Design a protein around this ligand. Structure first.
Ligand SMILES: C=C(C)c1cccc(C(C)(C)NC(=O)Nc2ccc(Cl)c(OCC(=O)O)c2)c1
Ligand SMILES: C=C(C)c1cccc(C(C)(C)NC(=O)Nc2ccc(Cl)c(OCC(=O)O)c2)c1
Ligand SMILES: C=C(C)c1cccc(C(C)(C)NC(=O)Nc2ccc(Cl)c(OCC(=O)O)c2)c1
Ligand SMILES: C=C(C)c1cccc(C(C)(C)NC(=O)Nc2ccc(Cl)c(OCC(=O)O)c2)c1
Ligand SMILES: O=c1[nH]cnc2c1ncn2[C@@H]1O[C@H](COP(=O)(O)O)[C@@H](O)[C@H]1O
Ligand SMILES: O=c1[nH]cnc2c1ncn2[C@@H]1O[C@H](COP(=O)(O)O)[C@@H](O)[C@H]1O
Ligand SMILES: O=c1[nH]cnc2c1ncn2[C@@H]1O[C@H](COP(=O)(O)O)[C@@H](O)[C@H]1O
Ligand SMILES: O=c1[nH]cnc2c1ncn2[C@@H]1O[C@H](COP(=O)(O)O)[C@@H](O)[C@H]1O
Ligand SMILES: [K+]
Ligand SMILES: [K+]
Ligand SMILES: [K+]
Ligand SMILES: [K+]
Lengths: 354, 354, 354, 354
C-alpha cells in the first residue's frame, strides 16, 4: 500500500574518495556562485536567524568573501537600517562587493510582504531571501512571480524545498537560486513534529540534478556540523552552504556572552521556536552553543577543511571538485572509525569538538 | 531453513516527502472514520488502560472530537457506571456525539464475557472493543461471531493483529474495525518476552491493504512517541490512532500527581504487567511518565503536528493525505539529523522533549 | 579479493510473525530431544561452567525437565562424585529420568581424556559433552571416533561449531548432537580477540539444515538474554538451548551471594578467562550477574516466554512450532520499539530487566 | 547526480568464518613480508609517531620480530642518532636482523627531503617510510622516483593511499610497499575535517587486489583496536599492520608515566595535531591512552589473538590464512553479541578492555 520512493542518505553516510592530485590545499580556488548573477569569493552564507545574523555578522561574512542574510524578525525600518549599515561599511582582500565597492548583503522576506521588499530595494539589498517552511507551495510560487513582475532585476532566492518537483516549480517561476533543507537544521524539529523531510545529502542530490537544467544554483541550508559536511554538500553539486549553529557562538552574532558551569555559551534558537515567535505549535527549539570566538577564526577552520578536501580529491576549483568527486557509502562502524576513537582527547582541536 | 518473509520498518525508518501544496495547516479537515459506521471529528482514541482512560478522559476525548475506551479492569457494574457518566455529560464545537446529542464512548471487553456486553449495550456504549494479546485466534474469532449473532448492529472493534492473514480473518468474521499492534507499545514487552511481533509501520501497511478489500478501517495502536508518528500512521493508510503514554500524564487520566526529584509524574503501566493483573508471566511493565497537563493541550499539540504534516504533503483531508503520500527510507544518521542535534536545549518545547 | 559469503543476523535482528492459533500458552507441549536417543521434557540445558552447574544446579534442571552439564574444571574423582550425587537424588512431575528412575545428568570432557570418560561411564553419566573452542578440527573429530569405538552406545555431544561444513564432519564422525556457538556467549571475547565467529541466528540456521540430513539435533549454546531468544532459537530449528548467564545468578549455581552497593550479585566467568584457567591469552572475562533467586522461578519465567510465543505462532509442540514459524527482519529502530521505550520503569518485571 | 561507487565496510562489520583445522595456535608460523625484499618474523610495525616510536620502541619491535619506524619530528642529526642506536644494539630468538646481525629499523621521511635520506642511508636504515597525508599525488610520486633514481636498492614504502588507482600509481613509480589508511587512525580527524577517506577493510581489499599485480605488499595502517582486527587485516590480504594507540601506552614509547584520578596514562597524539606541529588546520588530536606495560606483553597478547585466529581458520601460515579465509557481514546487533554483554566485568582481561 505505502509507496516508498528511495532510500535516502545524509552527510554521515558518505565519504569522498581520494583521487590523483596535483593541487595543494593552499592553491585551490573556492570562489563560487550565490545566484545566477552574484558570485561569492568563498561559499559560506550565515543563516537568516535572529541569533546568528545582523549587521556585524553580515559585515564579516562579506569582508571574508561570503554573505550574511539579515533575518526578518524585526520591523521593516530596523531591517532597512541593518542593511544600510552593511552597505556603508585592504586587510580583507577577498571581500565581496557590489559594483560600487560596497559590501554585499542579503535580507529575508516572507509571503505577502511587498512593502518590506520595496524598502529593502531602496536601501540597496543585493539579494532578497524568500523563506518559508514549505517552499513548494502556491503561496511561495505566487510571491516569486509578484516580486519578479515588479523587480525583474532583483536577485531572489526561494526556499526551502527538498524535491526535484519543488526545484522545477521554483525555477519555472523564475527564482535565481533555490534553498534546500527540510528538517536537517540543528535546532529544527519539523521532521519529528510533522513526519516530513528528506535527509540532506539526498535532498541536495535530487534538487541539483533538476536545477542544473535551468542554470540555477542550489544553497545547502542546515545540518552542517563539521567542515567535512561543507566539502560533501559542495561536492554533491550544491553551490553554497548556509550555516546557523557553527556561527551562532561567535562574537559577531546577536546576543551576549554568558558563562554556565565553567563553560562559555551564546544562545541560539529556531525561528519557529516559541521564543522567536513571541496556542502555537513550534517546529524549533531554544538553546545554547559553545562560544567559539571571532567569525574570522571559525571561517578559517571551515575553509581549511574545504581546501584540505579539494586537495585530496585533486580539484583546482569548485566545479572541478564537483566533476571529480566519487563517494562511498559507509556503515555505522565506519562512522565510528572516522571519528576519534579509543583515545581520550586532552587538548581540544580548534576544528573538532566532543 | 529459516523462512524470512520481509524486512520490516517502524516509524523512525521513514519520512514523508513534501509535495506541491495549496492547503494551509489551519484549513485542512481531519475528520476520519472510527468504524465503518462511526466517524470521528479528529483521529485520536485514548487507550483502554486503567492508567489512561476512565470517564473524565473519555469525556474530553469526545468533546475534542475523538473517543476514549473505558478499560475493563473493573467489575461490570463500575464499567457500566463509567459509560453512563460519559453519555450523560458549545465551547466544544467539534464534539463527537451520537444521534441524540450524547457524547460517544467505547468500552473494552474480553473473550467469553457476554454478560459484560449485555450490560454495556443497555447503558448505550457506542462501540465495544474486543482486546486480546492475540487477535488472530479461534477464541477471538468465535467471540466476534457470538456478539454479531446477538447484536448485529453493535459496532465491534477486534484486536490486536499484525498480519494480512489476521485482518482477513477478523474481517470475514464481520468486525467493523481492526486494531493493529503486537509489541510496539511504550510499556509492552511482548516482543522481548516471546519473540513475536511486527514493527508497526510494516504491520499497518500489510493490514490496511487487506482490510481495504472489505471496507474496514484500521486503528494504529501503540508506539506513538511524537506527533509525526501520527501523521505517518494515517498516511500509510490507517484511519485512526490509539494513544497510551502520551495521554497518561494528563489531568484527566486516573491516578494522582506526584513529584519525584523536582519533576512531576503520573504513573502508567501495561495491562499485562503484574500490578495491573493483581505465578504469572507478564508482557508489560509498571512505570511513570512526566506530567503534561490537560488533555486539551496535548491534543492541540498532536493535531497541530498532523495539520502541519498535511500542509507539507498538500492534502485537504485524510484520504487525500493517504493518496498523495510518498515516503523515503532513512538511515540511523538520518534519524539523528531529524532530531535536535549539536545544540543543548534550554527552553523545552511543548511538543518535543528530551 | 576478500570473499564474503553471507550477511548474517543474530537474535535481535528478527521477530516471529504471529499466525492463526487454536492453542493456548498453557496447553502447548514443550518436550523435545536432547540427542537422537535422549529426550527432554523442557528444552533447557545449564551450561558446563564452574560458576553455573554442579550437582545442585543439575538436580534442579533435571527435576524440572531439562539437563545440567557438570563442568570439567575439577579432578576426575570430584566430577565422578558430582555425577553420582545427581543420579542418587512427586512435586516434580516433569522430571527427566533414565530407565531406572534416576535423574539424568551430563558431564563435560576435553580432547585426550579417555580416563575421565571411563570413570564418568562407570558412574553412569547419561551424556558426555565434548567441549572445544574449535569443534571443527582434527583433534575433536579424532576424539569423537575414539569414544565411539570404545563406547558405541554412550550419547556424545560435540561442539562448538558454527558452519554447515562443521556439522557435516561431526555428524559423519557419528556424534549424537552438535553444539552451535562461536562467540555469542555473554562472557565470551573470542570474536573480538581472534576475529572469528558466526552470529548465532545464522549459525543455527546453517547447522540445522545440515544436521537434519543426519537426524542429529542442534543445541543452541550462548547469547540468550531474554526468553524470546529461546523461542527464536527453537523456531529456527534448534532442538534445545544451553544457558549460562541467566542461570548463573541462582541459588543453585556454585558461589555465594554477595551484596555490592545495595544490589545482590553472584559471580560468573568464562571458562577461557584467566581466573578459570588458574603467559595465557584468554577468550573470556570474569564478572558478576544480579541475583535472581531459585532456578525454578527463572525457568518458570523462561518457559512462560516460550509457551507464550508458541501460542502466538499457533503451534501445539516444538516441531509444529518449527514448521509454522516465519520471521521478519527488523531495523535498529524496530528493536527500540520492541523494548520498553519513552517510559521510566518503576516496578521491575520478573522477566524483563534494565 | 552524485556518483557512489561502493558500500564500504570496516573491521567491525565482518567476522572470519571458522574452517576445518589441523593446526594448533602454538604451531602456526606468522613470518611475513614487510617489503618485497625484507621479511618480518612477526607482522607488526610500530607507527612513525613522536609518542610511539623512538629507539627503545624500535629495539623491542625488532627484537620481537617486527619493526619500528623512527618518526621524523626531529632534526636530521637526532634521527640519524636514533637509527644508529637501534643498529648497534639470545633471549630474543625471533629477532629481525639485517645481513650483519644488526637489528632492522625504519625511519620516516617527507617530500623534498633528500638530505635527510642521504644521512639516513649513511647510518644504514633498512627501510625509509615516505609519509604524506595524500600519497596519491604528484609530489609523492615524484619523490618516489627521485629516491629510486639515486638509491635503486634502498627499500622505500609510500603512503598513505586508499584506492586501487593510488596503489597502481605508487607501484608503477616503483615503491617496495604501500601503506593503506586515510582516516581510520584512533587520533585521526581527516574524515571529519575534510570529508575524505575509505573505511579500512574496504580500502585494504581494493589496494591488495591491485598491488598483488605488481608483487608489492600492503601495510594496513591505523584503526586497530583489538587483536582480532589484526587477524582480519592480514586475512583480507594485507601483509603487515602498523600500530599506534595500542603501543603508545607502553614503557618503551616516548613520554613519561602519569597518574590521573587513580588510573595510569601515557600521552598519545596525532602527527597532524597542533601540539605535534609546534593559523594551522589540524587533522589530529592530542590525548591519553591507558598505561599497558612492556611492549613484549602487549605484543604477546596481540600475536596470541592472531595465532588463535589462524587456528580457527585452519591456516599453517599467513598466505594459507589468506587463501582459506571467508568472511561474513554482520549487523549492529551482531557486533553487540560478539562483545561482552549482559555481564559486568569485575576482573579485566589483559587483551579486552572497557
Ligand atoms: C522553518 C520553519 C519550519 C518555520 C519557521 C517559522 C515558523 C514555523 C511554524 C509556524 C512553526 N511552522 C510552520 O509554519 N509550518 C508549516 C508547515 C506547512 C505549511 Cl504548508 C506551512 O505553511 C506555510 C506558511 O505558513 O508560511 C507552514 C516554521
Ligand atoms: C496486551 C497484552 C499482550 C496482554 C494483556 C493482558 C495480559 C497479557 C498476558 C496474560 C501477560 N499475556 C498473554 O495473555 N499472552 C498471550 C500470548 C499468546 C496467546 Cl494465544 C494468548 O492467548 C490469548 C488470551 O489468553 O486471551 C495470550 C497480555
Ligand atoms: C570456549 C573457549 C573459547 C575456550 C575455553 C577454554 C580455553 C580457551 C582458550 C585457551 C583461551 N582458547 C583456545 O583454546 N582457543 C583456541 C582457538 C583455536 C584453536 Cl584450533 C584452539 O585449539 C583447540 C584446543 O586448544 O582445544 C584453541 C577457550
Ligand atoms: C596524516 C595526516 C593526515 C597529516 C600529518 C601531518 C600534517 C597534516 C596536515 C598539515 C594537518 N594536513 C595536511 O597536510 N593535509 C593535506 C590534505 C590534502 C593534501 Cl593534497 C595535502 O598535501 C600533501 C602535503 O601537504 O604533504 C595535505 C596531516
Ligand atoms: O525553527 C526552525 N525550524 C526549522 N528550521 C529552521 C528553524 N530555524 C532555522 N531553521 C533552518 O535551520 C538552518 C540552520 O541549521 P543549522 O546550520 O544546522 O544550525 C537555517 O538556515 C534555517 O534554514
Ligand atoms: O501489557 C501490555 N502488553 C502489551 N501491550 C499493551 C499492554 N498494555 C497496553 N498495551 C497496548 O499498548 C498500547 C499503548 O502503547 P503506547 O501508546 O506506546 O503507550 C495500548 O493501546 C495497548 O494496545
Ligand atoms: O571462556 C569462554 N569463551 C567463550 N565461550 C565461553 C567461555 N566460557 C563459556 N563459554 C560459552 O558460553 C556459553 C554461555 O553463554 P551465555 O549463555 O550467553 O552466558 C556457554 O554455554 C559456553 O558454551
Ligand atoms: O595526525 C594524524 N592524522 C591522521 N592520521 C594520523 C595522524 N597521526 C598519525 N596518523 C596515522 O594513524 C596511525 C595510528 O592509528 P591508530 O593505530 O589507530 O592509533 C599511524 O600509523 C598514522 O598512519
Ligand atoms: K579517525
Ligand atoms: K533537526
Ligand atoms: K515495546
Ligand atoms: K561475546
Amino acid at each position: 500500500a505505502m509507496k516508498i520512493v528511495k532510500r535516502a542518505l545524509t552527510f554521515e553516510d558518505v565519504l569522498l574518495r581520494p583521487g590523483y592530485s596535483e593541487v595543494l590545499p593552499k592553491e585551490v580556488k573556492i570562489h563560487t556562485k550565490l545566484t545566477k548573477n552574484i558570485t561569492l569569493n568563498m561559499p559560506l552564507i550565515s543563516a537568516a536567524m535572529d541569533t546568528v545574523t545582523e549587521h556585524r555578522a553580515a559585515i564579516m561574512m562579506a569582508r571574508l568573501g561570503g554573505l550574511g542574510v539579515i533575518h526578518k524578525n524585526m520591523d521593516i525600518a530596523s531591517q532597512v537600517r541593518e542593511v544600510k549599515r552593511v552597505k556603508k561599511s585592504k586587510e580583507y582582500p577577498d571581500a565581496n562587493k557590489d559594483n560600487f565597492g560596497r559590501l554585499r548583503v542579503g535580507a529575508a522576506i516572507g509571503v505577502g510582504q511587498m512593502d518590506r521588499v520595496d524598502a529593502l530595494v531602496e536601501a540597496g539589498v543585493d539579494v532578497v531571501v524568500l523563506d518559508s517552511a514549505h517552499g513548494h507551495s502556491k503561496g511561495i510560487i505566487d510571491t516569486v512571480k509578484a516580486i519578479k513582475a515588479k523587480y525583474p532585476n532583483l536577485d531572489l532566492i526561494a526556499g526551502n524545498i527538498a524535491t526535484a518537483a519543488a526545484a522545477k516549480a521554483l525555477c519555472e517561476a523564475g527564482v535565481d537560486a533555490v534553498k534546500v533543507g527540510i528538517g536537517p537544521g540543528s535546532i529544527c524539529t519539523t521532521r519529528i513534529v510533522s513526519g516530513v523531510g528528506v535527509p540532506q545529502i539526498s535532498a541536495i542530490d535530487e534538487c541539483v540534478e533538476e536545477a542544473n537544467k535551468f542554470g540555477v544554483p542550489v544553497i545547502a541550508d542546515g545540518g552542517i556540523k563539521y567542515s567535512g559536511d561543507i566539502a560533501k554538500a559542495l561536492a554533491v553539486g550544491a553551490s553554497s552552504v548556509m550555516i546557523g549553529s557553527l556561527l551562532a557562538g561567535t562574537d559577531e552574532s546577536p546576543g551576549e556572552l554568558f558563562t554556565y558551569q565553567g563553560r562559555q555559551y551564546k544562545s541560539y534558537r529556531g525561528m519557529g521556536s516559541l521564543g522567536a515567535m513571541q496556542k502555537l505549535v513550534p517546529e524549533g527549539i531554544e538553546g545554547r552553543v559553545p562560544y567559539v570566538g571571532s567569525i574570522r577564526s571559525v571561517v578559517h577552520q571551515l575553509l581549511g577543511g574545504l581546501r584540505s578536501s579539494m586537495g585530496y580529491v585533486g580539484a583546482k576549483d569548485i566545479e572541478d571538485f564537483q566533476k571529480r568527486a566519487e563517494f562511498v557509502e559507509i556503515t555505522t562502524a565506519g562512522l565510528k572509525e572516522s571519528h576519534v576513537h579509543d583515545v581520550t582527547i586532552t587538548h581540544e582541536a580548534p576544528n573538532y569538538k566532543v
